[PDB]
Nucleic acid binder design. Structure first.
Ligand code: K
Ligand code: K
Ligand code: K
Ligand code: K
Ligand code: K
Ligand code: K
Ligand code: K
Ligand code: K
Ligand code: K
Ligand code: K
Ligand code: K
Ligand code: MG
Ligand code: MG
Ligand code: MG
Length: 1319
RNA sequence: GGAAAUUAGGUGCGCUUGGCGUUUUAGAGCUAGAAAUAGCAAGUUAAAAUAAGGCUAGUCCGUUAUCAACUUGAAAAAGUG
DNA sequence: CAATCTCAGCCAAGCGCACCTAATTTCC
DNA sequence: TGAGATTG
């Protein structure tokens, strides 16, 4: 008889075996190998430790990058093949010189000057074209016949770096405002604007923030204000999106953005509300935006050149040359003794480090700004710097804004210019344009041919896919359909039927009727509330749901029960405020087709379901139009144009065959039929498919993975999923240890940034239109502080008082929990606010008082509309106006502190339960031999603090094993004391439930001071009430737990793992004469070309062999640890001997090769242990088993901040000698197994320095000292403010004669190999 | 313990794309001096690589998951205290 | 040799599906 | 946190 306790974490699985007396057993286990030791005694408690499991995301991002480098290469190969025959007539080695440009001259097969193959022509090219954009601009505008090699380089540069695809359609640069002003002055003939003299080009295209440009433009318009209509429109032409609610005295918020796909719909929404006479105002705003859309990237007049992008880069180049000549002359004239640092020293962030060194543009500006401010004549240079427009390069981080249409424009222009002289450029013009513009649809995927586990594409024809034959060779329709269909759910009720689109008309009829059919109404005179009949439900649908997008309860009472039913008063149940379901698609299609009778005709049901299916399945508007033209004769061509733009996303939970297909046999009605009319029963969906008097249930019944696959497919972090599979393996081994007998119980407990924070605040403050970010700038790293993070999430205001907060007074403010943390265990931003004083929340019993909600609800709404607070947060802030926290609400919160509700933890329980319990009884009911109990961490956590079983994580890893043990003790004792709780904890009025769950753990204590201020007494022996079984002896059982937590022998096992992943560090270092760098390609010798550093060792191998020594190459026997790198692993494993001989080894003892992955364990002298960090470095392999009296002392001494704390404080004073006893424990342990006397001396020296410090502070910093003794990799630590650096063990020689220890997953089964016998 | 709907927030898997960086080479450095050097001039660009590579040869695949030892088995697996 | 210093690929866009948690209505 | 280089 025994039970198993388990603690499942992200990097550990604790485990323990207990008997019915809560003792941990011990056994003699056989010891295999070749050593003196035949057996060993081990306690049945320990913890498996492992490195974190990783998601597949990084692997995915690298797989994408590989495909894009491959495809970018093919774009160039496509272009070169087109140029191939004609280039062979101009220069038969031009493409060869390009391919070998990387090679040193000695390795080159052709002349070293790539473009022209001789130095005079090469020098002359760069003289005439200092940048490629000079050549691109020349080839666009000039009419001369150009060298075919220069044509290629210009086109290749555009194709290789082609710009983004975020803008759909065609772009044609062309650089109006006087017309829009004249337009507004017509639509508002009584209130005209005068824009005479307003330089609209300079004000709006200026570099500053758009909020400032808006102010600059409005400053030139007297009588107009920024939040006026015209002021709000200026943002629409600029690219922002303001709200026009107050401009038109609207009731609902309405915004507009030109770049969004819903602009024409939101404009139709606004124009249908304000009057079509305003169409010309948004029309002139859209006409102005076309000419000023590329003003950020096209800083050049478009009438002077057809290559404004390359012209803009030449502008960067020219201003760079002018300003560099200026800067040099200034420094030479004023600060001559700083010229060498600025323009020669690459190590400094001056111009030299900017051009030749590793200084970025941002680092160069920071270095040079104080130099400019100190000197005279740097007026314009300072302005360019603060505009981030000084001495700019052309290839820069901000070129991501360039759309591919801009590069396409110059590409097309060069082709038009030069096709007049080269016939092949005319015949391949559209082919070349296709190379630049073609983009593999994301709904097609990799263009594979049966060897990619990621691909789904199918081909119309079996031939190579090119950018020019893609539409003909690839079946886009079937591929796009497969893309979705391989991922969408099937109806769990009819597993062979696909679910409907979420926006299907039938699906929304189902949702509306399912909700409607359970509404009840009662009026004065009715005996009881009545359901709605079929005629009443149809009347409500036709009258309300088919005329309003949403249906409120007020509309139901006034527009149906009053007008139709002639009820003055009526009470409604089954719906609150408004109906949740609605016929959204019905009103979408009504506005598009403008034919209500068509929508209401049931004959058109199949057509409308296929239309919405097409709109949901496909995203490409042209594929949608293609799939819709079977119905083109049904609609006006203008309607079809709007129909193809109406796209939907998302799928429902049920199939069409379920909701309106299968029929009840006796009635002949489908499920939707019953929802529309079901006599006076009004059975809903759940009732219909569970009713034995209908045939839906039986038809759904007649329609109805390995362990690793099952766990892998679970939802949750792949980190926690690693511990789940390891937990199952730990349990399997423990059962085998206990003679294949299964346990009585298994108690499981499962443990519970700066980039996104800056984004939520930037997006939120922009939504509010606040200038808090300009008044108080921040960095993404500063928002890690929770008080400063709350300051910006609240726009610098108090959440409980309508007042500004002081950003320099955050230390005096309070961080209060919305729902008091005494009820719920939420310390996240969603349950915290920043207030001046927490007392202003109201009372501490409940949610913030009603008075606070009445004052701050509107302010909270603006934060909710800016995503600065979540809906769950807003609902918790405002819960007082809905009764606050009810007595039931308090009982649920305290219950959820005990009963684990996470789905992932239930899956672990289910997994263990279905593996332990496999038999069935006479009634074919499962026989639950093993009870799987789930506990929350707070249960054992409180048990530790209540009975002085304290935990200090930094001391060692034993706390994982102790946690699992206490889980088993508390779990079994709880189920023994209260067997009724098995429904809550075993897999398989309101005040009373609150008081019950509040005192569920009281049976452990002897004296209990409850909340009501009373003292209860319980006997030393707690028993179950029904049986006579004793469950807890408050004398001997606590002592048994104390003996367990003090046992020094705990099986801590670091899981040995082969290392996988990248071959090495990714940096390409410069060439060096070392043999440490790794070639980037087969023939790229790092002595000439540089290469990679630091290869990752996959595992090490023990090699007993001979190696040649000296010029004579005489053979000498060696025993060595050889690191097999990740890149080498496949070759080594394919033939180990040939691999080792290629490394220089001879006469390898083949059967003595031992594979030694990372963390392989070795024992040396005096119990000292080491783990392999690699082939050349070791990790610490021992655990410091600090006695329990010292662990409890450190906990109480470090946590100085009931009145019984005096008794705890007193115990600290009487045992102040424990501080020196702990230092001696650390010293003796370190002198035995750590062997870092330099650091240890600095430890003892730092400890003697701070013996005058308060005892709490000394106890806090002693906890840091255990970093020296911790298991695993050495790490730096500090004692008070003395930093002690790590001592690495960068030699593996000593383990070659030590004892190698192979451990099973629990560490109970050992094989020990004495390596000194090898050699 | 489940189901649908509504509202909101998270996570996973997969696909298609943009911009940098880095590396080697190309962009004639000049003058004085035997040289060491010194005084100047110059700098913004490009090519190519971006896991070595692989066979299945695709505009495909190559960094996740999973792994003590021993025995029998190539392998898969099973077994051993 | 040791003690000590030094270094580590990054930023961005769009799209699809499937899960999970947490409050609400209605049900099994 | 392994490992390359520099300093002692
Ligand atoms: K050569
Ligand atoms: K004004
Ligand atoms: K550089
Ligand atoms: K630089
Ligand atoms: K560059
Ligand atoms: K509602
Ligand atoms: K769609
Ligand atoms: K038509
Ligand atoms: K791995
Ligand atoms: K890893
Ligand atoms: K192991
Ligand atoms: Mg790229
Ligand atoms: Mg490649
Ligand atoms: Mg580049």
């Amino acid at each position: 008889k025994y039970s198993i306790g388990l603690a499942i974490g992200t990097n550990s699985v604790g485990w323990a075996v207990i008997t019915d007396e809560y003792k941990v057993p011990s056994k003699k286990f056989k010891v295999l190998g070749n050593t003196d030791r035949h057996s060993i005694k081990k306690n049945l408690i320990g913890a498996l430790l492992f490195d974190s499991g990783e998601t597949a995301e990084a692997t995915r991002l690298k797989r994408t990058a590989r495909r894009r480098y491959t495809r970018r290469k093919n774009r160039i190969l496509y272009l070169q093949e087109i140029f191939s025959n004609e280039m062979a007539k101009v220069d038969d080695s031009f493409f060869h010189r390009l391919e070998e440009s990387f090679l040193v001259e000695e390795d080159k097969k052709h002349e070293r000057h790539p473009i022209f193959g001789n130095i005079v022509d090469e020098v002359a090219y760069h003289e005439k074209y200092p940048t490629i954009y000079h050549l691109r601009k020349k080839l666009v505008d000039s009419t001369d016949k150009a060298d075919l090699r220069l044509i290629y380089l210009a086109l290749a540069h555009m194709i290789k770096f082609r710009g983004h695809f975020l803008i759909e359609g065609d772009l044609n640069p062309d650089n109006l405002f006087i017309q829009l002003v004249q337009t507004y002055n017509q639509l508002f003939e009584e209130n005209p604007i005068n824009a005479s003299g307003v330089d609209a080009k300079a004000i709006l295209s200026a570099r500053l923030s758009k909020s400032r440009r808006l102010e600059n433009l409005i400053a030139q318009l007297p009588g107009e204000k920024k939040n006026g209509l015209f002021g709000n429109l200026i943002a629409l032409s600029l690219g922002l999106t303001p709200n026009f609610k107050s401009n038109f005295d609207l009731a609902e918020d309405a915004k507009l953005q030109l770049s969004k796909d819903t602009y024409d719909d939101d404009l139709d929404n606004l124009l249908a509300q304000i009057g079509d006479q305003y169409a010309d105002l948004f029309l002139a705003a859209k006409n102005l935006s076309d000419a000023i859309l590329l003003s950020d990237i096209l800083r050049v007049n478009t009438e002077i050149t057809k290559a404004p992008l390359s012209a803009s880069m030449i502008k960067r180049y020219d201003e760079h040359h002018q300003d560099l000549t200026l800067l040099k002359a200034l420094v030479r004239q004023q600060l001559p003794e700083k010229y060498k640092e600025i323009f020669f020293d690459q190590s400094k962030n001056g111009y030299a480090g900017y051009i030749d060194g590793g200084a970025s543009q941002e680092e160069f500006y920071k270095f040079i700004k104080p130099i400019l401010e100190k000197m005279d004549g740097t007026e314009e240079l300072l302005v360019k710097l603060n505009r981030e427009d000084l001495l700019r390069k052309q290839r820069t981080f901000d070129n991501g804004s360039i759309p591919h249409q801009i590069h396409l424009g110059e590409l097309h222009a060069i082709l038009r210019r030069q096709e007049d002289f080269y016939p092949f450029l005319k015949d391949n013009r559209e082919k070349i344009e296709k190379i630049l513009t073609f983009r593999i649809p994301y709904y097609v995927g990799p263009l594979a041919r049966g060897n990619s586990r990621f691909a789904w594409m199918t081909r119309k024809s079996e031939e190579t896919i090119t950018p020019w034959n893609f539409e003909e060779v690839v079946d886009k329709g079937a591929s796009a359909q497969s893309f979705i269909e391989r991922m969408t759910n099937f109806d769990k009720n009819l597993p062979n039927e696909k679910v409907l689109p979420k926006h299907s008309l039938l699906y929304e009829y189902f949702t509306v009727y399912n909700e409607l059919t359970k509404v009840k109404y009662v009026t004065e005179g009715m005996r009881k509330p009545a359901f709605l009949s079929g005629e009443q439900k149809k009347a409500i649908v036709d009258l309300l749901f088919k005329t309003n997008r949403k249906v409120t309860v007020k509309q139901l009472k006034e527009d149906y029960f009053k007008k139709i039913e002639e009820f003055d008063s009526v009470e409604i149940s089954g719906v609150e405020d408004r109906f949740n379901a609605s016929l959204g698609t019905y009103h979408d299609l009504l506005k598009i087709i403008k034919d209500k009778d068509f929508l209401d005709n049931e004959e058109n049901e199949d057509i409308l379901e296929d239309i919405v299916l097409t709109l949901t399945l496909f995203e490409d508007r042209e594929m949608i139009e293609e799939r819709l033209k079977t119905y083109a004769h049904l609609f006006d061509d203008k309607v079809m144009k709007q129909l193809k733009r109406r796209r939907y996303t998302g799928w429902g939970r049920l199939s069409r065959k379920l909701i309106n297909g299968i029929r009840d046999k006796q009635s002949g009605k489908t499920i939707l039929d019953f929802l529309k009319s079901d006599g006076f029963a009004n059975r809903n969906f759940m009732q219909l498919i569970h009713d034995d008097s209908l045939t839906f249930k039986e038809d759904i019944q007649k329609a109805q993975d390995s362990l690793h696959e099952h766990i892998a497919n679970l939802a949750g972090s792949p980190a926690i999923k690693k511990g789940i599979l390891q937990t199952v393996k730990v349990v399997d081994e423990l059962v085998k240890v206990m003679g294949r007998h299964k346990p009585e119980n298994i108690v499981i407990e499962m443990a519970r940034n700066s980039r996104e924070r800056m984004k939520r605040i930037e997006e939120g403050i922009k939504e509010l239109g606040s200038q808090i970010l300009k008044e108080h700038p921040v960095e993404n790293t500063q928002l890690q502080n929770e008080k400063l993070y709350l300051y910006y999430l609240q726009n610098g205001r108090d959440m409980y008082v309508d007042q500004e907060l002081d950003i320099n007074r955050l230390s005096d403010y309070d961080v209060d929990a919305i729902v008091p943390q005494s009820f719920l265990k939420d310390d996240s931003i969603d349950n915290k606010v920043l207030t001046r004083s927490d007392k202003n929340r109201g009372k501490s019993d409940n949610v913030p008082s009603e008075e606070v909600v009445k004052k701050m609800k509107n302010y909270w709404r603006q934060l909710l509309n800016a995503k600065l607070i979540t809906q769950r947060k807003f609902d918790n802030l405002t819960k007082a106006e809905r009764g606050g926290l009810s007595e039931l609400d308090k009982a649920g919160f305290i219950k959820r502190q005990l009963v684990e509700t996470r789905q992932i933890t239930k899956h672990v329980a289910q997994i263990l339960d279905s593996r332990m319990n496999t038999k069935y009884d006479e009634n074919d009911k499962l026989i639950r031999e093993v009870k799987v109990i789930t506990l929350k961490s707070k249960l054992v956590s409180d048990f530790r603090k209540d009975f002085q079983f304290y935990k200090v994580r930094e001391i060692n890893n034993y706390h994982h094993a102790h946690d699992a043990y206490l889980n088993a003790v508390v779990g079994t004792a709880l189920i023994k004391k209260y067997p009724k709780l098995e429904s809550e904890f075993v897999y398989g009025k309101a005040t009373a439930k609150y008081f019950f769950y509040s005192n569920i753990m009281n049976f452990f204590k002897t004296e209990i001071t409850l909340a009501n201020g009373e003292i209860r007494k319980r006997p030393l022996i707690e028993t179950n009430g029904e049986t006579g079984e004793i469950v807890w002896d408050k004398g001997r059982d606590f002592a048994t737990v104390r003996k367990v937590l003090s046992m020094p022998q705990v099986n801590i096992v670091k899981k040995t793992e082969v290392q996988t992943g990248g071959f090495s560090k990714e940096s390409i270092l410069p060439k060096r004469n070392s043999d440490k760098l790794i070639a980037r390609k087969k023939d790229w010798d790092p002595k000439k070309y540089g290469g990679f550093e630091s290869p990752t060792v996959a595992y090490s191998v023990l090699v007993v062999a001979k190696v040649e020594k000296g010029k004579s190459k005489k053979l000498k026997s060696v025993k060595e640890l050889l690191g097999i790198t990740i890149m080498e692993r496949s070759s080594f494993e394919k033939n180990p001997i040939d691999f080792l001989e290629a490394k220089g080894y001879k006469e390898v003892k083949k059967d003595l090769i031992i594979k030694l992955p990372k963390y392989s364990l070795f024992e040396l002298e005096n119990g000292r242990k080491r783990m392999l960090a690699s082939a050349g470095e070791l990790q610490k392999g021992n655990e410091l088993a600090l006695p329990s009296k010292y662990v409890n002392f450190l906990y109480l001494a470090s946590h100085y901040e009931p009145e019984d704390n005096e008794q705890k404080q007193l115990f600290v004073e009487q045992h102040k000698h424990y501080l020196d006893e702990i230092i001696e424990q650390i010293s003796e342990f370190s002198k035995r197994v750590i062997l870092a006397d330099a650091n240890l001396d600095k430890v003892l020296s730092a400890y003697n320095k701070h013996r005058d410090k308060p005892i709490r502070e000394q106890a806090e910093n002693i906890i840091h000292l255990f970093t020296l003794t911790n298991l695993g990799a050495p790490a730096a630590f500090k004692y008070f403010d003395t930093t002690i650096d790590r001592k690495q063990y960068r030699s593996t020689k000593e383990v070659l004669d030590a004892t190698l220890i192979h451990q099973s997953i629990t560490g109970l089964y050992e094989t020990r190999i004495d390596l000194s016998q090898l050699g």
